[PDB]
């Protein structure tokens, strides 16, 4: 009997609900990834080398203060979303809570720089034991493998000086050295990987894992590695709601 | 088997023949001669003093061909008074010549077992559906397909109970006598056929809603990006609608060529394949999905003990995906005879009767999300 | 020299401490050890609103007691109608990461903002009756966490670069910039005259500004950890603060001192949103353990709980007329309590 | 539940003919 | 620089010190008076009858 | 008002022993995970050691493992760092930092440039 106002309001609500239902599929069909790292990690290069897989369409203007960035890439029609954090202050304790519904937090580490590698280790440990990131799997990208290979095969490194465990260490049994790699380079690479996996395995339980990867600088398969890790994360999540795992 | 209706029809024909024979045949009426009598079993002609009147084993017998040779004997007194056994109220009527020439315990045991299983399944599943529907947090697309599985199991239990009641009534003494004399009992009413069509539809919908769950799980593990609403509508149409496409043709083809009685017997093994072949397809498909999911679980466990976790995963996947039937199912009804029949029937009936209870326990009473919801509700009730 | 400057700062801090100690005489509890207890208030969700696909991070009540705008990390600014659970607008955001929201005190504008260091201002009533970004305000070198419409032509924004700024929508400039914080400024609440406003920073300290002049008048210490939310007494002479140390606190302006601290041993998680009631006797506050907590300003005894959420409560606002309380939480659901 | 019913019915009706014959033999 | 920041902090502290601080008893009395004056007009503290309440 | 004061820094010959004490006030000491952060001249801040709420969990950086010892006195609200066999590379300004939130394992922003709950530093020269 009211009609008029009520009828128009119900019509508008139904149209808005149709729009929301249409946007639900688009929102839930894309995967959001947070890219974390430091200045000397090749993070910009990693973003550039996955960006090649995607009235003026050019948007180089943007904003001088930037804020949050974005880089959308498509693999096998899955349409990942990758959020590189731009011009923000040092402390990340209160805007990292926004990234709690995220398929995976990509973490990029400079293995070559032994001086600041402890800082990366501490940052990874802090990310691992954050209350709002206790279910977010971290994909580990140990960048700058070519620089590491150059550094170990040239001396003047003394990894034992920074880490008093290299001398009392052995190459892992499951090591898979690349054809042509010296034993020393593989030893150092797997030592760094085990250094990160010590934090990864401690705590963590079973609700989130770490996926180490030896990304060198410009490998075209970084995006495929990200896709495979996201697929594995989703499969493990789906196997857990069914209590099959 | 030999249906009762055929026997009573043949008895009516024999009675008509005997009635016309008593009129056509003239009585000799000789010295101390008897007269024609009808004991409702054999057409007795007129007798003679001391003459053992022999009448061949009458037809309309359910066995009949079992005793081709044999005569029914009924003598007469020396004064012609239809000699009686020990001077009783009826003539001496030895009929041992035309006589007969064990599954009951097994069937009763199976009935008891599966009735208890279906009762437990019905109770546990109504409780589980109430639990899943009351908690508005448990409204995923996964928990919508689970609810339809529970509804299919409940419908199967109701149809099974109704079919058992219909069988017990239609094979009672009162209905048997009604079909004996002149009446068309439950066996000749359309309610019988409707009940025994509803049974098969419910069974098929139960078999095709475990397939839907396997398909959904495979699509979750395999290629995932999809439209939730359209896919759920497709699964609803493929769970409650696909079984119609081979149940309704079964009802149409068993109303034309093989009506028998109440559509309860399967004397023809060609019309019964309309519900066996699709069900075998839905069983076999769920085995492949079960194997693939177990392979994926093994890969996930190995990538990261393994034996116990894999055993638990297989034992919790067996109830959900109906892969406990993969053992026998392809053992066809045409070849299975004897102890194999009892073993296959016991496995199928008992395990699919308790499958409802097992699924309810493993996916609505033990599931960690349901326990978390109950604990949250209890804690909220600690403040009241 | 810097050591002498540090010594002078320490001496000034001690002087301020003893000056504040000269007015303590009797605490708030001693004065208020006569009021009858408020009693248990049981609030049941009258309306629950559905439609957000992700966690909702902010919300503002319109100045008509009816309309309500919600901001969620999905990238939507849905404008509701709490009377009939009707969706009126579904404004799509340019940046999905939004941590604030606002409603102009006329019903004509609705702002937002987030990790993009930007403040998008949306016009609600145009010739075509459509929403569109009237202006985008840039100039903050950090994530933005709160927008409050001071008027139809000025909004105050608090960001993560330890500064607060006042904007002019017509030009987009930064007429007055408020500095003095040493940490991220999370939440700000204007006073009920649109003349003074206060902001709670992450350095465990609150401050009051002067809008026009643009400098701090007083600072308030006592909190041990980061401040996540802050509200204002309806009389404009007090403001409650909620921090990560699981303690709500009530400050005062004329006294320039802490008055009461709301805490309990059963409570260990911080506070995410604080909102006073119309009479200033119900200090509602969200919590990280998925339930709010109806406190009270004077007795400081936790009275009631609006426990209905399956995830962190992220926003909480009492309506101007006082007949509703909306609680938006990370479970993507808004609930109207009464 | 289709193979079992075709076994119960085939045996239940099998004894029905015997009961009918017995009724015709007992005296009807 | 650090010296400029320290000088600004010292000036801010000096400006904060020169105020007219009021005893907390009077502020508590003002808050109590406001609460008891607006108690009857608060719908949350004093529930409104369901007929008048727009949320049903 | 959270305040941290450090003392015990001074000139020491190489191989010597220096003890640093950090007295804290304004917050419940037992509820927070305390850290030690040092900043070498011409470089950035570097994390040194951390200690849990109860003093059970202890960790150190590689350069100081086996030489430095960190302990906390919950009753006295004081944090200690015992330094042994000082090296010339250990000359730095030492800050006594605190985890931002209580009852938590993550220590974010402790090594940041403008962290709030950090001491004003004591100079140690070798
Ligand atoms: C379908 C089934 C049935 C039917 Cl009607 C007729 C004959 C048998 C057996 C030969 C295989 C069975 Cl299993 N059924 C249906 N409603 C029943 C109620 N109760 C019993 C049941 C169950 C256990 C023992 C005995 C009984 C019956 C025979 C009784 O007491 O009359 C059996 C019932």
């Amino acid at each position: 009997t009211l009609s008029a106002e009520d009828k128009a309001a119900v019509e508008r609500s139904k149209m808005i609900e149709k729009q929301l239902q249409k946007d639900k599929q688009v929102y839930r069909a894309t995967h959001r990834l947070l890219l974390l790292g430091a200045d000397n990690s090749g993070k910009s290069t990693i973003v550039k080398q996955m960006r090649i897989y995607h009235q003026q369409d050019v948007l180089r203007t943007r904003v001088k203060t930037s804020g949050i960035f974005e880089t959308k890439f498509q693999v096998d029609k899955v349409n990942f979303h990758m959020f590189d954090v731009g011009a923000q202050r040092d402390e990340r304790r209160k805007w990292i809570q926004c990234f709690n519904d995220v398929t995976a937090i990509i973490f990029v580490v400079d293995s070559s720089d032994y001086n600041r590698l402890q800082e990366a280790l501490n940052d990874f440990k802090s990310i691992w034991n954050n209350r709002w990131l206790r279910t977010i799997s971290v994909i580990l990208f140990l960048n700058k493998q070519d620089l590491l290979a150059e550094k170990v095969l040239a001396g003047k490194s003394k990894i034992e000086d920074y880490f008093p465990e290299f001398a009392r260490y052995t190459t892992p049994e499951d090591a898979t050295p690349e054809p042509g790699e010296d034993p020393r380079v593989t030893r150092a690479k797997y030592f760094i990987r085990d250094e990160f996996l010590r934090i990864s395995t401690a705590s963590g339980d079973g609700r989130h894992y770490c996926y180490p990867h030896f990304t060198c600088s410009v490998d075209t398969e970084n995006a495929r590695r990200i896709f495979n890790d996201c697929r594995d994360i989703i499969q493990r999540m789906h196997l857990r709601q069914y209590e099959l795992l | 088997t030999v249906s009762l209706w055929e026997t009573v029809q043949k008895w009516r024909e024999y009675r008509r023949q005997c009635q016309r024979s008593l009129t056509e045949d003239p009585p000799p009426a000789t010295d101390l001669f008897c007269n024609r009598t009808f004991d409702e079993y054999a057409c007795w002609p007129d007798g003679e003093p001391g003459s053992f009147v022999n009448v061949s084993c009458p037809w309309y017998l359910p066995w009949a061909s079992s005793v081709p040779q044999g005569h029914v004997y009924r003598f007469c007194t020396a004064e012609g008074l239809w000699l009686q056994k020990d001077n009783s109220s009826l003539p001496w009527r030895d009929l041992s010549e035309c006589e007969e020439s064990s599954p009951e315990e097994q069937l009763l045991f199976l009935y008891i077992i599966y009735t208890v299983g279906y009762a437990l399944s019905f109770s546990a599943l109504v409780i589980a559906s109430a639990i899943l529907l009351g908690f508005r947090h448990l409204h995923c697309t996964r928990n919508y397909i689970h609810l339809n599985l529970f509804a299919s199991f409940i419908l199967r239990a109701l149809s099974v109970f109704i079919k058992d009641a219909a069988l017990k009534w239609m094979y009672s003494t009162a209905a048997q006598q009604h079909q004996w004399d002149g009446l068309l009992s439950y066996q000749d009413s359309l309610s019988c056929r409707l009940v025994f069509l509803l049974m098969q539809y419910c069974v098929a919908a139960n078999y095709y809603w475990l397939l839907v769950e396997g398909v959904y799980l495979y699509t979750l593990l395999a290629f995932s990006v999809l439209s939730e609403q359209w896919i759920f509508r497709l699964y609803v149409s493929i769970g409650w609608g696909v079984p119609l496409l081979f149940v309704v043709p079964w009802g149409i083809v068993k109303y034309l060529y093989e009506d028998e009685g109440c559509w309860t017997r399967n004397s023809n093994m060609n019309y019964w394949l309309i519900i066996r072949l699709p069900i075998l397809f839905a069983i076999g498909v769920n085995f492949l999905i079960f194997v693939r999911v177990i392979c994926i679980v093994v890969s996930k466990l190995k990538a990261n003990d393994i034996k116990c976790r894999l055993a638990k995963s297989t034992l919790t996947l067996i109830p959900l995906l109906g892969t406990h039937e993969v053992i026998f199912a392809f053992v066809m009804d045409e070849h299975a005879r004897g102890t194999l029949r009892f073993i296959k029937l016991f496995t199928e009936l008992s395990f699919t009767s308790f499958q409802g209870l097992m699924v309810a326990i493993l996916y609505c009473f033990v599931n960690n999300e349901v326990q978390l919801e109950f604990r949250k509700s209890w804690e909220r009730w600690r403040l009241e | 020299e810097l050591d002498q400057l540090r010594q002078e700062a320490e001496q000034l801090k001690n002087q301020i401490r003893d000056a504040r100690k000269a007015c303590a005489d009797a605490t708030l509890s001693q004065i208020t050890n006569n009021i009858d207890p408020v009693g248990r208030i049981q609030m049941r969700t009258r309306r629950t609103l559905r439609g957000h696909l992700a966690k909702i991070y902010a919300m503002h009540w319109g100045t008509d007691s009816r309309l309500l705008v919600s901001a969620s990390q999905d990238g939507k600014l849905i404008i509701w109608d709490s009377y009939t659970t009707n969706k009126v607008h579904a404004i799509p955001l340019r940046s999905s990461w939004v941590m604030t929201c606002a409603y102009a005190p006329s019903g004509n504008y609705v702002a937002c903002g987030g990790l993009d260091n930007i403040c998008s201002i949306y016009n609600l009533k145009t010739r075509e009756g459509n929403v569109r970004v009237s202006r985008e305000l840039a100039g903050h070198t950090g994530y933005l966490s709160c927008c409050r419409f001071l008027d139809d032509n000025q909004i105050v924004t608090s960001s993560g670069d330890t500064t607060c700024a006042l904007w002019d929508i017509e030009t987009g400039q930064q007429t007055t910039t408020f500095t003095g914080h040493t940490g991220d400024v999370m939440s700000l609440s204007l006073a009920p005259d649109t003349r003074l406003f206060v902001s709670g920073a992450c350095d465990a300290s609150a401050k009051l500004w002067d809008v026009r002049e643009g400098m701090c008048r007083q600072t308030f210490t006592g909190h041990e950890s980061d401040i996540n939310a802050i509200c204002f007494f309806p009389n404009g002479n007090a403001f409650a603060t909620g921090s990560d140390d699981a303690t709500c606190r009530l400050f005062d302006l004329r006294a320039d001192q802490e008055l009461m601290t709301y805490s309990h041993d059963n409570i260990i998680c911080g506070i995410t949103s604080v909102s006073f009631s119309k009479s200033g006797r119900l200090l509602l506050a969200g919590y990280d353990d998925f339930n709010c907590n109806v406190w009270d300003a004077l007795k400081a005894d936790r009275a009631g709980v609006l426990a209905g959420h399956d995830n962190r409560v992220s926003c909480l606002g009492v309506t101007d007329d006082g007949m509703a309380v909306a609680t938006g939480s990370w479970d993507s659901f808004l609930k109207i309590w009464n | 539940e289709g193979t079992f019913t075709s076994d119960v019915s085939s045996y239940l009706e099998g004894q029905a003919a015997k009961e009918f014959i017995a009724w015709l033999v007992k005296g009807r | 620089a650090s010296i400029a920041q320290a000088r600004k902090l010292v000036e801010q502290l000096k400006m904060e010190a020169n105020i007219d601080r009021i005893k907390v008893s009077k502020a508590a009395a003002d808050l109590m008076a406001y609460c008891e004056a607006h108690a009857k007009e608060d719908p949350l503290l004093t529930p409104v009858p369901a007929s008048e309440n727009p949320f049903r | 008002q959270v305040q941290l004061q450090e003392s015990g820094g001074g000139l020491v010959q190489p191989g010597g022993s220096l003890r640093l004490s950090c007295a804290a006030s304004g917050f419940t000491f037992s509820n927070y995970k305390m850290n030690w952060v040092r900043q070498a001249p011409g470089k950035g801040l570097e994390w040194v050691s951390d200690i849990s709420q109860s003093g059970a969990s202890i960790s150190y950086t590689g350069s100081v493992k086996g030489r430095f010892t960190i302990s906390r006195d919950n009753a006295k609200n004081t944090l200690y760092l015992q330094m042994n066999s000082l090296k010339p590379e250990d000359t730095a300004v030492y800050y006594c930092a605190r985890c931002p939130a209580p009852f938590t394992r993550d220590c974010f922003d402790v090594t940041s440039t403008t962290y709030a709950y950090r001491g004003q530093g004591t100079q140690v020269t070798v």
Side-chain angles (χ1 to χ4, degrees), chain A residues 188-205:
Chain A
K189 295 184 337 176
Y190 278 100
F191 170 54
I192 294 152
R193 203 209 49 171
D194 279 342
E195 209 69 21
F196 276 94
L197 276 183
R198 267 215 306 263
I199 306 176
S200 147
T201 40
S203 88
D205 200 69

Side-chain angles (χ1 to χ4, degrees), chain B residues 103-104 107-108 111-112 164-165 167-168 171, chain D residues 4 8 11-12:
Chain B
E104 59 251 54
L107 296 189
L108 250 169
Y111 162 73
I112 283 295
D164 277 354
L167 268 160
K168 190 186 185 65
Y171 283 132
Chain D
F4 182 70
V8 156
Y11 160 75
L12 257 178

Side-chain angles (χ1 to χ4, degrees), chain A residues 53-59 61 63-108:
Chain A
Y53 280 24
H54 170 265
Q55 86 291 307
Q56 186 65 244
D57 52 351
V58 172
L59 289 176
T61 61
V63 190
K64 47 169 185 175
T65 192
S66 69
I68 197 82
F69 293 134
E70 197 165 14
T71 287
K72 317 175 274 315
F73 48 91
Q74 275 240 354
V75 164
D76 292 23
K77 312 307 289 168
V78 194
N79 204 24
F80 297 104
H81 270 260
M82 202 175 148
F83 285 119
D84 171 38
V85 180
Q88 313 257 15
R89 225 170 38 99
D90 294 351
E91 324 173 26
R92 342 185 304 285
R93 21 163 195 173
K94 290 283 146 51
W95 62 260
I96 207 64
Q97 308 181 339
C98 285
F99 300 98
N100 89 9
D101 48 354
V102 159
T103 314
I105 286 176
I106 288 135
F107 203 81
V108 186

